[PDB]
Amino acid sequence: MNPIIYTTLIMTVMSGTMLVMISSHWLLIWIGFEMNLLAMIPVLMKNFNPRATEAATKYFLTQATASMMLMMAIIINLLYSGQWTITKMFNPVAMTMMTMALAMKLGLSPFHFWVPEVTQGISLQAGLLLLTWQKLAPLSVLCQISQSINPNLMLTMAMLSILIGGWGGLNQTQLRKIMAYSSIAHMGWMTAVLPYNTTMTILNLLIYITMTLAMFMLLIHSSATTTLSLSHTWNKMPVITSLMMVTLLSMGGLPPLSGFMPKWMIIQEMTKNESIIMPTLMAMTALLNLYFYMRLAYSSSLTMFPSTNNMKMKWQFEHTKQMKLLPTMIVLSTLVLPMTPALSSLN
Amino acid sequence: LQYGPLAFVLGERTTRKLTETSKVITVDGNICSGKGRLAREIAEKLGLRHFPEAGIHYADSTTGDGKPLDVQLSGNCSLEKFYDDPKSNDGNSYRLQSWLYASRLLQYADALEHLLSTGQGVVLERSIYSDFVFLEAMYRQGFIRKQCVEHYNEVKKVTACEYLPPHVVVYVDVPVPEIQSRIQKKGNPHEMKITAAYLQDIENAYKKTFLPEMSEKCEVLQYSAREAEDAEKVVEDIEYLKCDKGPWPDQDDRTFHRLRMLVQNKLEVLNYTTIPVYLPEITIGAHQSDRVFQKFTELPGRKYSPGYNEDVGDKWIWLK
Amino acid sequence: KFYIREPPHGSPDWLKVGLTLGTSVFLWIYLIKQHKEDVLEYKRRNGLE
Amino acid sequence: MLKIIIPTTMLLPMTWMSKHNMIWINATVHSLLISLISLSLLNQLGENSLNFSLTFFSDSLSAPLLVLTTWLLPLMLMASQSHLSKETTTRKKLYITMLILLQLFLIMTFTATELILFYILFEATLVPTLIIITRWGNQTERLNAGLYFLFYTLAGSLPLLVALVYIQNTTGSLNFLIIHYWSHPLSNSWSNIFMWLACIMAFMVKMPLYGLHLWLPKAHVEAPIAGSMVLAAVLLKLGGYGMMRITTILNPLTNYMAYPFLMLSMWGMIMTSSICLRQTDLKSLIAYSSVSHMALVIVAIMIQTPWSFMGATALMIAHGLTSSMLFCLANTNYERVHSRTMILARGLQTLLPLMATWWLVASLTNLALPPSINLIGELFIITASFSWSNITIILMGMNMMITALYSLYMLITTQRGKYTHHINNIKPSFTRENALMALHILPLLLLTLNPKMILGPLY
Amino acid sequence: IRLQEDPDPEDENLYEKNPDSHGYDKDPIVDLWNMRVVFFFGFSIVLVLGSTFVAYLPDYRMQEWARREAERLVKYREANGLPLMESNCFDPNKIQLPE
Amino acid sequence: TMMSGRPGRVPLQFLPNEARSLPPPKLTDPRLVYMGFLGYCSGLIDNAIRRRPVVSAGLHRQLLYVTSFVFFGYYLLKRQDYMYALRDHDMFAYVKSHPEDFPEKDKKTYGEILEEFHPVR
Ligand SMILES: CCCCCCCCCCCCCCCCCC(=O)OC[C@H](COP(=O)([O-])OCC(O)COP(=O)([O-])OC[C@@H](COC(=O)CCCCCCCCCCCCCCCCC)OC(=O)CCCCCCCCCCCCCCCCC)OC(=O)CCCCCCCCCCCCCCCCC
Ligand SMILES: CCCCCCCCCCCCCCCCC[C@@H](O)O[C@H](CO[C@H](O)CCCCCCCCCCCCCCC)COP(=O)(O)OCC[N+](C)(C)C
Ligand SMILES: CCCCCCCCCCCCCCCCC[C@@H](O)O[C@H](CO[C@H](O)CCCCCCCCCCCCCCC)COP(=O)(O)OCC[N+](C)(C)C
Ligand SMILES: CCCCCCCCCCCCCCCCCC(=O)OC[C@H](COP(=O)(O)OCCN)OC(=O)CCCCCCCCCCCCCCCCC
Ligand SMILES: Nc1ncnc2c1ncn2[C@@H]1O[C@H](COP(=O)(O)OP(=O)(O)O)[C@@H](O)[C@H]1O
Secondary structure, three states: OOHHHHHHHHHHHHHHHHHHHHOOEHHHHHHHHHHHHHHHHHHHOOOOOHHHHHHHHHHHHHHHHHHHHHHHHHHHHHHHHOOOEOOOOOOHHHHHHHHHHHHHHHOOOOOOOHHHHHHHHOOHHHHHHHHHHHHHHHHHHHHHOHHHOOHHHHHHHHHHHHHHHHHHHHHOOOHHHHHHHHHHHHHHHHHHHOOOOHHHHHHHHHHHHHHHHHHHHHHHHHOOOOHHHHOOHHHOOHHHHHHHHHHHHHHOOOOOOOOHHHHHHHHHHHHHOOOOHHHHHHHHHHHHHHHHHHHHHHHHHHOOOOEOOOHHHHHHOOOOOOOOOHHHHHHHOOOOHHHHHHHHHHO | OOOOHHHHHHOOOHHHHOOOOOOEEEEOOOOOOOHHHHHHHHHHHHOOEEEOOOOHHHHHHHOOOOOOOOOOOOOOOOHHHHHHOOOOOOOHHHHHHHHHHHHHHHHHHHHHHHHHHHOOOEEEOOOHHHOHHHHHHHHHHOOOOHHHHHHHHHHHHHHHOOOOOOOEOOOEEOOHHHHHHHHHHHOOHHHHOOOHHHHHHHHHHHHHHHHHHHHHHOOOOOEEHHHHHOHHHHHHHHHHOOOOOOOOOOOOHHHHHHHHHHHOOHHHHOOHHHOOOOOOOOOEOHHHHHHHHHHHHHOOOOOOOOOOOHHHOOOOHHHO | OOOOOOOOOOOOOHHHHHHHHHHHHHHHHHHHHHHHHHHHHHHHHHOOO | OHHHHHHHHHHHHHHHHOOOOOHHHHHHHHHHHHHHHHHHHHOOOOOOOEEOOOOEEEOOOHHHHHHHHHHHHHHHHHHHHHHOOOOOHHHHHHHHHHHHHHHHHHHHHHHEOEHHHHHHHHHHOHHHHHHHHHHHOOOOOHHHHHHHHHHHHHHHHHHHHHHHHHHHHHHOOOEHHHHHHOOOOOOOOHHHHHHHHHHHHHHHHHOOOOOOOOHHHHHHHHOOHHHHHHHHHHHOHHHHHHHHHHHHHOOOOHHHHHHHHHHHHHHHHHHHHHHHHOOOEHHHHHHHHHHHHHHHHHHHHHHOOHHHHHHHHHHHHHHHHHHHHHHHHHHHHHHHHOOOEOOOOOOHHHHOHHHHHHHHHHHHHHOOOOOOHHHHHHHHHHHHHHHHOOOHHHHHHHHHHHHHHHHHHHHHHHHOOOOOOOOOOOOOOOHHHHHHHHHHHHHHHHHHHOHHHHOOOOO | OOOEOOOOOOOOOHHHHOOOOOOOOOOHHHHHHHHHHHHHHHHHHHHHHHHHHHHOOOOOOOHHHHHHHHHHHHHHHHHHOOOOOOOOOOOOOOOOOOO | OOOOOOOOOOOOOOOOHHHHHOOOOOOOOHHHHHHHHHHHHHHHHHHHHOOOOOOOOOHHHHHHHHHHHHHHHHHHHHHHHHHHHHHHHHHHHHHHHOOOOOOOOOOOOOOOOOOOOOOOO
């Protein structure tokens, strides 16, 4: 792919998301979604191989079905209200269809399989962009339409997402599938807190994006896509393994790291509204995520797996490409707990 | 500046610098032949750049100071031990074979980078495409194992599926008795311990597999010893051949940009040479790996990046 | 001349060094001026001085 | 409290900027200086605590624990010197950094004035301990030990976080002074029962409680010497401190919910002492003895009488010191013979007289020989339990008998008898080891001389 | 065999290379000064100075003050014939029972 | 969403004109010091990742890290203080406007208040 074409497609994806986030018209929001998907498909199919083609095909099918459902919901809402402005939807059936379409776009359970499938199919940069941006946009739409969301359905989908992410991450071995299930669990947390405080939703989004960027960029730096491939990193650059370990600890919600702040704020907000059982179950279920994070950290940082012989040549040579904002994302993902009251600024 | 997408956008195109002599003339040949002399003759006459045959201390040569490192820190293998005890129980034979394949892959990447950054052709004494003959010769004699052969095949596939094919098997066909006579005349005892069956297996691998395989891709120019003495005839034959062979005619500017980005990054070149396949011959224990890495870091000019080593005479560290 | 190849960071990039130092100094002086203006505006608006 | 907090955050850069051969010297000297500085917190009042600021305060319960932590850091440094000779400079500095961070988190946990900050720091102590165990442990089971420890603690403590945020929303503040002055009785309903369960179960899993204690042998056996020293002496006391702090808002429901935990704790004393009777590993014996003592402290806290809190505090301090000394002795014996089996090495009194003396003193302090603070705390707890009911005396008596039995059993097995013939690498005891044992044992006798400093705020 | 692994090294004895070793470090001077600083600081400073500091800590617990106040109250009570210990902590006049 | 949709809210404005009536954060603020500490840590991590002397290489870029973090932290603190002040102002206004919803209660002394006593035995 030509660099000019690649940057044009990236800017088209970003422009589609910006159009979705700045448009007050349902037709314009749908147009932004269509543009985002259209420009996103080649980014997935950059490195051409049958696995990438299959991942792109599955992603296209899922996103097209979600877009059709979203347009149907828009039309149904227009039928009973005659309004195009994105506000509290005036029809429960249209609201349910919109919620299901946005859940399918985000990856919430039971619409989650395509997330690990595509993430394994595509490369690390494609997975990073996919997760981050393609979860950034529908969450903005949901935050705009929050006041009409059915709490029962939203919380059911959120809890299912958390459980499914935990169990999938427990069983998986591939780094990209682990990241996909982590994304599913964090989206579950965000959508669980969504019907109560969109500010907490945005805070969780920002923290999750920072941690995911840090983890994916560390994986790109180490050029590891499996557990055993990552197990050789300690013999070439042990600093990266330690940074990855602290990032994994933060993603598990362990205090006093940055990952504990979203869970803490969400628990507080949900327990303000006389909801105890849901926060308790959500907090207890994150232990599965922390378990597979710790299992991944054992193989890379806290132990020394056997190495190979060409690693000496690896030592002789030096990394050339420099990651952008990697130290900043590492610091922001582990040491911003004492700056929690900035959520008022985020408000 | 360093080559990249910004340079490509600005207009640094590879096909602009390419010429008729911009050819990766790999010269494939046999053991103890005049291939090294023939390659040097071809490089001078055609104006190309000659790469000496890749090795452990060739891999050691390109990085830092050109002086070689200790065998413990680099390679962990020796050719003399392979000659003395080919079937030793420490896996030195396959360890040496894998290290030599990695060195040849690095050398091919360097040659491609030089060709695509300067437009000058390159002459290689041996390449990764002809490296499998030694592995087959070892396997026939029983020096290495089937698992070693499978690991070599996997690494070779995943690492050589990327780069462009070589240019000529200049097979300096020297009979095995003449090879043995030359080895005896040279006088090195370790190579004098080479058996005749091992030398025959290399020739069988070249003639039965490598020669037919490369005939489809490109022209193959086979010469005897006396024919290879006349390098002018070889040069004339090289300049004569013209056809639509290989992917080079269909190579585009974008493909050349991708290839240059791949070959300018050595860690991406040597990425799949360390796949997690735990053969006893190549696997290193955790404690030994840690100790050897500590020694390598204790080496004089290799603790930090090249521009940030005070002990070797780097200044302005605090402003760099 | 220890390294056979010239390292990409062999010599300091004086352009980058100057840009970095100038940016740091400019940001610091702008922050100090902004703080002084904010203090004066707060005092004027609240009538303290 | 900043006069103690800042010197630790200065220990960090000092450790990372010191020379390769001076890290241990600098760390030990400045840790001793910080301990001397922290000794000033023992000047507590009689009515109200010392309120330094809105964030940190010191009480007659917090001060001895802070002094114990600041005193325990240099001993861990000495043990690390012992067992980390061949490590690289960067890894040694990382180990010292982990110890320093753990000490800082413990200090802030003990001096925190609000329950949510207390929870944050008390959970922050998990990371350095897990890293130390799973990184510098010697055997394969260290990963499993770390997993068990981390997940037991988190499964205990997450409902505590939910309960704390609920309590703040309901009442207005989690500040300890406010929740003590504005305390109101807790009605006997299912919601109050479950809130009580959340808080108490969190601190009991941390304590630990019998039935929730397997993580303790798993982690203490497989941890390095410094990790074992900090796990047994200080990290076990976080649960006791929390229970003595959190029970202010749980009355009168504690009078009704304490029965299952009291029965569990007493029968756990009995069971763990009996387990100590038949242990083939010395570290496991010490760990189960720690479990028994913590069960006794649980009984004291649950019966919750003014004579039981003083005994609880005294027993916590005494057990911390005694367990640290026992672990140090066991580690010396292990480093001599590279095995934790107790019957492997014998005749150690013939081979090493001074270590035999240290073993005798440590085992005498373990079995609560009067007038040691171990016995003071145990006797206060026993008297309070007798006032509570008149069969607790039977249970305490049999527990005390079995405790003496297994203490003297391990002493006789390790030190007395005929030396093993084929073990010929028993070098004379080092001055470092002798000084470590002396620094462990002398403060116990000094606190015996002056016992009012470790009897809590109810003295 | 399965790996190219180093053999387990024999444990080094500090007394072999230094019969006067204190067990702190393999360098003689560093070992000697580590022992000296540990002994001096810990034993002398911490033990002796902290022990005497704690012994002579001021009576902020008001034990002696409480004893003197108790003596004064006992003297005043038994001089005037009043009971030594009052029946109630608070004043029933100020306490208003619900009725 | 609570604050969004408040009357008089200008979109995409980091700090409105009414925020200038509040005391600006002091340059010696502990939060600003923590932001500078985060910048210094980011610089050290940059040196470690790029394999340079951590505490002595790239002093200019470490200074730039610290300066940028301090600048953004100062503006973030200003916005946070403005938001909290606005929240308190709205709360007090609503409490004033709804006295029947927020009534004063009689203050009874503990001598008058009857509370049950639960013995501990
Ligand atoms: C004021 C107090 C502030 C305290 C802040 C505390 C928190 C700091 C967070 C940020 C730290 C950034 C560190 C960057 C990486 C550095 C690595 C390194 O080599 O360092 C050696 C480096 C020099 O050695 P080198 O020869 O250049 O490097 C050798 C190579 O690394 C070649 O060596 P190698 O590759 O052979 O080394 C192998 C090593 C390579 O791996 C590492 O070195 C990784 C170490 C962790 C880095 C990532 C940390 C991320 C954040 C974690 C936060 C956790 C909670 C922290 C709570 C803090 C509360 C205060 O890997 C292993 O050993 C494998 C096993 C790993 C086990 C687990 C390790 C990670 C534990 C996670 C928590 C660590 C927290 C403390 C970290 C301290 C690091 C210095 O020294 C320093 O970096 C010292 C930095 C501190 C002093 C700076 C100078 C100050 C002078 C003036 C003082 C004035 C005081 C008053 C004013 C203060 C104004 C600020
Ligand atoms: C020789 C054989 C020894 C072993 C067998 C023992 C046999 C009995 C030996 C008795 C020897 C001592 C007898 C004489 C004692 C004289 C000193 C004693 O009288 O003073 C004590 C005081 O001792 C100290 O208080 C002990 C200090 C204990 C604390 C030391 C801490 C050191 C740092 C270590 C930290 C460890 C942390 C552990 C958690 C805190 C008691 O307090 P007090 O009589 O009224 O003080 C008088 C001063 N006044 C009048 C103004 C009040
Ligand atoms: C570690 C995770 C946090 C990452 C922090 C970086 C994230 C990007 C920050 C980019 C800041 C750009 C500011 C430049 C001016 C932007 C003005 C406009 O875009 O936003 C303004 C300010 O809004 C911004 O969202 C606030 C920026 C706050 C950035 C820091 C957030 C910190 C969150 C707490 C994390 C703990 C602190 C960690 C240290 C940073 C006004 O918004 P407004 O249109 O009128 O309100 C309605 C919009 N809603 C619906 C989204 C609310
Ligand atoms: C919005 C993104 C802004 C990104 C700015 C940085 C450039 C792109 C990323 C490059 C890679 C990251 C690491 C950079 C340092 C290491 C590489 C190096 O040597 O860079 C040299 C360069 C010299 O500085 P110079 O070119 O003068 O930059 C200012 C120009 N006006 O050194 C530098 O330029 C150092 C700059 C450090 C910047 C740290 C990141 C920004 C922090 C801002 C504070 C707020 C943080 C919170 C999140 C963002 C909020 C807006
Ligand atoms: N892949 C390989 N495996 C084992 N040995 C190899 C391999 N490649 C080269 N060698 C050894 O390197 C030596 C190269 O000698 P060569 O350069 O052919 O001699 P001359 O310079 O006389 O032509 C040979 O003796 C051969 O045994």
